[PDB]
Design a protein around this ligand. Structure first.
Ligand code: GTP
Length: 125
RNA sequence: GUAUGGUUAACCCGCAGACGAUCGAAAGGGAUGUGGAUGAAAGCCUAAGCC
């Protein structure tokens, strides 16, 4: 298990995280790739950040969970980084994706934002 | 004199790429860049370069 994964995410909740990227890709604006994601977080324009769990080395995305907590931006973990790139609409894999405007997925992001709040309180005791 | 340029183009497999393609000195920026296989007839036009 990676060290940058602060909390475990169930499969069913992670599957909706890909759907949010899929919907917001067509009905909103997302940013695919770790560089675009990092900029979207430090600029404070990212509604939800999605981080992959199969990132090696960790030093590529290990700074997002700390940065997202400072900027008070929710984040959720996805197992596959290739499926993450597929949901963003690119041929290659993606280590992280940032959702700027959810669009039609506005409701789905709210549901994920609540559960990542509850999952974060449980792992923190 | 000469096509490696045209009239005249497709269709296959591969390689690199959101761990950042193209562009840029960098900053920036964000999805293409490319190697090969068979085709690209005949005739005709042009002659940069080369001889
Ligand atoms: O048939 C051509 C050719 O034999 C000869 N010619 C002119 N330049 C070259 C060259 O660089 N390399 C070769 N191998 N042959 C060349 O000239 C013939 C054409 O006749 P012209 O001389 O009338 O026309 P051109 O424009 O070639 O030369 P010119 O008109 O200045 O004299």
């Amino acid at each position: 298990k990676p060290s940058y994964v602060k909390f475990e995410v169930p499969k069913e909740l992670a599957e909706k995280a890909l759907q949010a990227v899929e919907i917001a890709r067509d009905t909103g604006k997302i940013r695919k790739g770790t560089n675009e994601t990092t900029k979207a977080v430090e600029r404070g324009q990212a509604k939800l950040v999605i981080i992959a769990e199969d990132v090696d080395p960790e030093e590529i995305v290990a700074h997002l969970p700390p940065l997202c907590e400072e900027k008070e931006i929710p984040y959720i973990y996805v197992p596959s980084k290739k499926e993450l790139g597929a949901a963003a609409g690119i041929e290659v894999a993606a280590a992280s994706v940032a959702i700027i405007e959810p669009g039609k997925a506005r409701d789905l992001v709210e549901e994920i934002a609540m559960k990542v709040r509850e999952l974060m309180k449980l792992e923190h005791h």
